[PDB]
Amino acid sequence: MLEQPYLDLAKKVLDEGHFKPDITHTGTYSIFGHQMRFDLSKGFPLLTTKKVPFGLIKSELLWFLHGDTNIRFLLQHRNHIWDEWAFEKWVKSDEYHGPDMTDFGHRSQKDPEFAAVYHEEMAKFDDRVLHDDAFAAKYGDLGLVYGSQWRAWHTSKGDTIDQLGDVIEQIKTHPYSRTLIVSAWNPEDVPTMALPPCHTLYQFYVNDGKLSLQLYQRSADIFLGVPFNIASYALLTHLVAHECGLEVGEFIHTFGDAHLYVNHLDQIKEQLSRTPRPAPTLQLNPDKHDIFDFDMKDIKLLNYDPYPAIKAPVAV
Amino acid sequence: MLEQPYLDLAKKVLDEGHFKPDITHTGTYSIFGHQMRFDLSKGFPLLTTKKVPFGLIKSELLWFLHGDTNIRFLLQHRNHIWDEWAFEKWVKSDEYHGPDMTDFGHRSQKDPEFAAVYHEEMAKFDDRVLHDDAFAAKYGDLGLVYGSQWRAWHTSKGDTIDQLGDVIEQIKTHPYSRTLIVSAWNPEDVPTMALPPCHTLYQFYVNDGKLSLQLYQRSADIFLGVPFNIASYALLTHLVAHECGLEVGEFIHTFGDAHLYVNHLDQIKEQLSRTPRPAPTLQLNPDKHDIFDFDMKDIKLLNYDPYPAIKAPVAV
Ligand SMILES: O=c1ccn([C@H]2C[C@H](O)[C@@H](COP(=O)(O)O)O2)c(=O)[nH]1
Ligand SMILES: O=c1ccn([C@H]2C[C@H](O)[C@@H](COP(=O)(O)O)O2)c(=O)[nH]1
Ligand SMILES: [K+]
Numbered sequence: 001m002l003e004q005p006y007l008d009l010a011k012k013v014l015d016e017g018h019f020k021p022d023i024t025h026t027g028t029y030s031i032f033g034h035q036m037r038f039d040l041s042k043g044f045p046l047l048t049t050k051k052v053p054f055g056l057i058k059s060e061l062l063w064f065l066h067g068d069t070n071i072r073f074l075l076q077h078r079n080h081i082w083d084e085w086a087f088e089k090w091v092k093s094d095e096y097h098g099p100d101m102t103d104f105g106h107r108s109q110k111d112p113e114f115a116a117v118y119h120e121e122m123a124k125f126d127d128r129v130l131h132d133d134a135f136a137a138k139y140g141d142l143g144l145v146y147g148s149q150w151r152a153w154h155t156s157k158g159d160t161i162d163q164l165g166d167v168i169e170q171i172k173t174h175p176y177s178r179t180l181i182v183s184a185w186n187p188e189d190v191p192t193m194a195l196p197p198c199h200t201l202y203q204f205y206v207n208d209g210k211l212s213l214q215l216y217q218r219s220a221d222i223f224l225g226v227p228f229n230i231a232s233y234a235l236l237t238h239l240v241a242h243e244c245g246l247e248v249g250e251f252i253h254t255f256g257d258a259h260l261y262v263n264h265l266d267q268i269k270e271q272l273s274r275t276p277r278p279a280p281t282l283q284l285n286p287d288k289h290d291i292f293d294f295d296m297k298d299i300k301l302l303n304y305d306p307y308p309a310i311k312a313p314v315a316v
Numbered sequence: 317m318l319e320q321p322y323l324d325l326a327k328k329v330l331d332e333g334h335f336k337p338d339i340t341h342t343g344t345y346s347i348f349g350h351q352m353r354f355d356l357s358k359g360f361p362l363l364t365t366k367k368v369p370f371g372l373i374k375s376e377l378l379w380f381l382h383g384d385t386n387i388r389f390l391l392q393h394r395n396h397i398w399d400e401w402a403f404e405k406w407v408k409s410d411e412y413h414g415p416d417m418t419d420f421g422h423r424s425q426k427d428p429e430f431a432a433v434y435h436e437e438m439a440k441f442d443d444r445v446l447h448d449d450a451f452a453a454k455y456g457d458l459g460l461v462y463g464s465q466w467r468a469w470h471t472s473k474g475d476t477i478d479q480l481g482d483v484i485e486q487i488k489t490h491p492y493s494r495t496l497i498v499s500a501w502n503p504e505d506v507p508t509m510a511l512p513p514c515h516t517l518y519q520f521y522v523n524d525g526k527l528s529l530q531l532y533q534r535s536a537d538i539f540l541g542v543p544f545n546i547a548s549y550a551l552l553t554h555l556v557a558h559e560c561g562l563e564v565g566e567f568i569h570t571f572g573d574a575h576l577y578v579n580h581l582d583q584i585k586e587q588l589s590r591t592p593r594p595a596p597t598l599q600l601n602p603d604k605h606d607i608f609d610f611d612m613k614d615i616k617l618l619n620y621d622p623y624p625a626i627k628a629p630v631a632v
């Protein structure tokens with residue numbers, strides 16, 4: 001089965017990952033240096049042993065594609081993946097007139113009462129971003145995110161580089177180029193960033209008219225993050241291949257530090273007892289080919305019949 | 317004694333059940349409309365007048381709980397309860413290259429030679445499911461079983477409903493809800509199903525911090541099926557109450573057509589001559605509370621000292 005590589009990764013970490021403590025000491029078992037590969041000709045690698053909200057990866061990807069870095073687009077599609085990073089700034093500012101909200105993501109978990117005040121301040125925030133263009137342009141704009149790194153890489157000459165756009169062009173004119181790389185790691189920004197890019201860089205490759213992609217991920221949460229990550233870049237490979245008129249190749253996922261948070265031990269073990277089902281099939285709108293102008297309705301997934309969703313504590 | 321209700325049921329059917337013929341005419345004595353109730357505060361209702369393999373009900377329940385519908389999990393725990401339903405499809409297919417196997421469950425009993433060929437084809441099948449992920453995903457998946465009905469009820473909108481999960485949530489937030497019901501009867505599937513759900517539906521109820529459960533069973537084999545059925549739902553009541561932090565209430569078993577196969581007449585009479593012993597006590601792992609991630613070791617039974625096991629012909 002297609003998802004086997006991910007299940008194998010889980011096993012290896014379980015019985016070979018060594019205990020390493022991270023910033024918050026949730027605790028992790030980890031390995032360093034790993035590579036899985038998925039053949040997109042067999043099916044889309046969306047985990048079947050656990051339901052994964054594809055809508056969330058579809059809108060988040062489009063968000064990056066448009067070179068957007070403003071939360072508003074996400075909220076318009078009910079995608080609250082990036083909220084806390086934006087909300088963080090709204091709290092740590094001059095106009096914020098409310099409860100402390102300091103260490104919210106942590107205090108909430110350790111307090112069923114704070115989880116409510118925080119839940120509301122967040123709700124109000126999301127609303128203001130959704131209707132106050134000025135508030136949106138100020139607290140909704142994340143600035144340095146994948147959308148701007150991929151498509152608005154700032155140069156020392158005050159200009160902007162559309163890395164993705166250019167590479168898709170180089171794919172069409174120079175298919176056998178060994179320099180078809182998009183990077184999200186900028187040394188001058190990384191040391192100030194709240195969250196330096198996890199998905200450091202990716203390289204495209206063409207052969208026999210098939211397009212493959214390799215992704216180097218410097219850090220990965222195996223239980224929570226990876227299932228989203230696999231689908232995201234498997235989707236990109238399909239889209240970029242749609243625009244370039246190529247047939248799908250392989251998705252190679254390379255890992256630096258792949259870890260399993262000690263608090264997700266039983267959820268993963270449970271998932272492992274599950275037997276994979278046949279993979280779903282993706283279907284991209286044939287009439288539209290400018291992937292930059294793609295919409296939610298343009299990407300269609302089929303025959304995805306997963307197991308129940310597993311609930312786990314987002315380590316922090 | 318706790319199990320008395322079951323013994324009373326046996327008596328009533330013996331001297332009041334009327335002869336009704338079923339599909340295969342094994343023959344049955346039956347009544348329609350019956351209700352027994354067990355107070356789980358007195359002990360776990362596992363029959364003592366006849367040894368019942370608790371391991372089988374424990375793994376079969378967990379199987380449902382995980383929303384699993386693939387035989388493989390069962391075999392991994394030596395549970396061959398669901399085999400024949402899966403094996404049936406393996407035989408009635410295109411890849412099957414072996415003996416007829418038609419009407420196997422019947423021909424076997426009427427032929428000590430077929431019971432051997434069938435016994436082997438079955439053995440090979442169980443092995444392939446245990447090691448061939450592709451074979452497992454194809455012939456091991458039962459599809460419409462309690463695991464998927466309870467936790468993956470398919471909607472007309474191509475989505476899935478986690479009935480159990482949602483109800484456990486409603487129990488925690490709305491304890492006095494009169495709509496805490498999980499149903500396994502879907503009118504659009506029932507007419508095609510090989511075996512429409514026996515355990516039609518069950519309702520939870522909270523009062524005085526105690527959780528009770530009522531189970532409506534449309535059909536029940538009194539000698540063979542019922543002892544397994546009582547324990548199964550008495551176990552569920554304990555688990556769901558463990559997650560919800562409630563104390564145990566009662567298990568109410570409601571029957572539609574409760575029958576005794578004419579071929580089990582002497583085995584039940586024999587069992588009736590037996591005097592019940594004190595009921596065993598259940599003990600759930602205190603550290604783990606997410607019943608969906610429970611394991612065989614998490615559920616412990618104590619002081620179960622039954623009489624010898626009674627052997628009877630599984631009517632077919
Ligand atoms: O889509 C994502 C985003 C993040 N991470 C995880 C990796 C780490 O668990 C944490 C980031 O920690 P640092 O590497 O920044 O220290 O988030 C993923 O696996 N997938
Ligand atoms: O755990 C179970 C499963 C099935 N049955 C019995 C009820 C009937 O004897 C037979 C099903 O017959 P129908 O109701 O489908 O016709 O299996 C039980 O009592 N307990
Ligand atoms: K770089």
Ligand SMILES: [K+]
Binds near residue numbers: 501502503
């Ligand atoms: K129903």
